């Protein structure tokens, strides 16, 4: 029955990823005064299916200069970690209920970094190497800021358990409590998922497709699926962390509907941002986090350590 | 003593023998140095968790902190050596003799 639950967590996520690709194309089209896909199926509903079939029936090639073992492992690692990030999320009941559900997320994201590095290095091309090193710098900056912000917000919670996050947000929203950390968290999640204005690992204008320039057919589709799954997962985590839905134990479908609606709102906001803004320079991205976010993040961490003590509102440990 | 402790001590010995046997790169020896502290961390936490030494649980964290300080120091020295000689090879550190 647990295997059935694993399948029920995996397959709908992949389907949601395909239709997120469709939704992004259509949303960008309408924000750019176009229409987007509306020919392949009714309102372009079969477009993700057509693209997936085409990619997995096209020929994948291994470059003559590539290191084949880590050329293959990198998409496997990316997609496996993308599917793994979903197991501790409470919707409202996690598939795997972890005592430290947040540190697991941080560790698995830090591991999922290395798929980009190894795919860029194993490809043995200059554009791939440049994309890999852009990933290195991006991870430096966003990682330090993300860890401090998570520490502060979960300090308002009492523990690292996401069900406890639901219980904490029973009455109001953590975004009402801590909106500055919410803004910096949203920007950091953009940088972490490599979304515009921070899509520097795969920057088409500067690098020809960045780190996955040498990838074709199926192995490219795996990177695409992993990236979009990470987008949805990070928005789901943000919704759980800052926009806490009401939970009724006898009818848990209401929490699921609220959670899905909030997640979709955040994902569509990601697409909106991509349509609206230019692209950063990765040195300016590093200088943004360290010279702007890190001081405010440290000050807010001090503030959110002191605030429960000075007001006698320290959360319960369990 | 369980076989787990034997394996952890064996990993430490392997990482120590790796450090003491340079090949060409200074970076590989630094990685061997980082493995030794990882094995030390694992051994210490296995010993502490088994014995319920509650106040000693913070010791592996301090161990990690000073591992980080050592790694930072080694990387700084490596960049200086590479700036001087063009490569991180240990054969270039031969100006001084015994």
């Amino acid at each position: 029955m647990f295997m059935i639950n694993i399948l029920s967590l995996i397959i709908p996520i992949l389907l949601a990823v395909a239709f997120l690709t469709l939704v992004e194309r259509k949303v960008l089209g309408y924000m750019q005064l176009r229409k987007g896909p509306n020919v392949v199926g009714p309102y372009g509903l079969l477009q993700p299916i057509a693209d997936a079939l085409k990619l997995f029936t096209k020929e994948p090639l291994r470059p003559a200069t590539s290191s084949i073992s880590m050329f293959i492992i990198a998409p496997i690692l990316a997609l496996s970690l993308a599917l793994t990030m979903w197991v501790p999320l409470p919707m409202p009941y996690p598939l795997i209920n972890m005592n430290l559900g947040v540190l697991f997320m941080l560790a698995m994201s830090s591991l999922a970094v290395y798929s980009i590095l190894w795919s860029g290095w194993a490809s043995n091309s200059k554009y791939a190497l440049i994309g890999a090193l852009r990933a290195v710098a991006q991870t430096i900056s966003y990682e330090v800021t993300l860890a401090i912000i998570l520490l502060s917000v979960l300090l308002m919670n009492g523990s690292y358990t996401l069900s406890t996050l639901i219980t904490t947000q029973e009455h109001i929203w953590m975004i009402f409590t801590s909106w500055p950390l919410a803004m910096m968290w949203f920007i950091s999640t953009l940088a972490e998922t490599n979304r515009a204005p921070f899509d520097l690992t795969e920057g088409e204008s500067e690098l020809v497709s960045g780190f996955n320039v040498e990838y074709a057919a199926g192995p490219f589709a795996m990177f695409f699926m992993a990236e979009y799954a990470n987008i949805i997962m990070m928005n789901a985590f943000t919704a759980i962390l800052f926009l806490g839905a009401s939970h009724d134990p006898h009818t848990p479908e209401l929490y699921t509907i609220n959670f899905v609606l909030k997640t979709l709102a955040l994902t569509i906001t990601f697409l909106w941002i991509r349509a609206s803004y230019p692209r950063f320079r990765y040195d300016q991205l590093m200088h943004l986090l360290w010279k702007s976010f890190l001081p405010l993040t440290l000050a807010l961490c001090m503030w959110h350590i002191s605030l429960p003590i000075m007001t006698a509102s320290i959360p319960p440990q369990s | 003593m369980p076989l787990v402790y034997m394996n952890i001590i064996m990993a430490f010995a392997i990482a120590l023998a790796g450090l003491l046997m340079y090949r060409s790169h200074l970076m590989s020896s630094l990685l061997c140095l980082e493995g030794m502290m990882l094995s030390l961390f694992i051994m210490s936490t296995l010993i502490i968790l088994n014995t319920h030494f509650t106040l000693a649980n913070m010791m592996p964290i301090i161990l990690l902190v000073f591992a980080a300080c050592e790694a930072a120091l080694g990387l700084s020295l490596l960049v200086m050596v590479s700036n001087t000689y063009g490569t991180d090879y240990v054969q270039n550190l031969n100006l001084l003799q015994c």
């Binding site: 239709f19 939704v23 358990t161 899905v260 | -």
Partner: protein, 70 residues
């Protein structure tokens, strides 16, 4: 017009409904129609083990009461 985006969002939402509802239904199915027991600590785990022992069917969710004490 802009409402032609909605069917794709509807499909994506329907896909995101499946995991949570499926997990809730499977939790209730394998725990006798009740919430799956959360055991974050040794005390809660020991309570679950004692419930398994007293049930007589090697299942913690089979709850026994006054009709069982007498």
């Amino acid at each position: 017009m802009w409402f032609e985006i909605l069917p794709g969002i509807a499909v994506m939402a329907a896909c995101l409904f499946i995991p949570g509802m499926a997990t809730a239904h499977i939790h209730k199915f394998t725990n006798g129609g009740k919430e799956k027991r959360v055991a974050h600590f040794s005390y809660q785990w020991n309570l679950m083990e004692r419930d398994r022992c007293i049930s007589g069917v090697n299942r913690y969710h089979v709850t026994k009461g006054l009709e069982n004490i007498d």
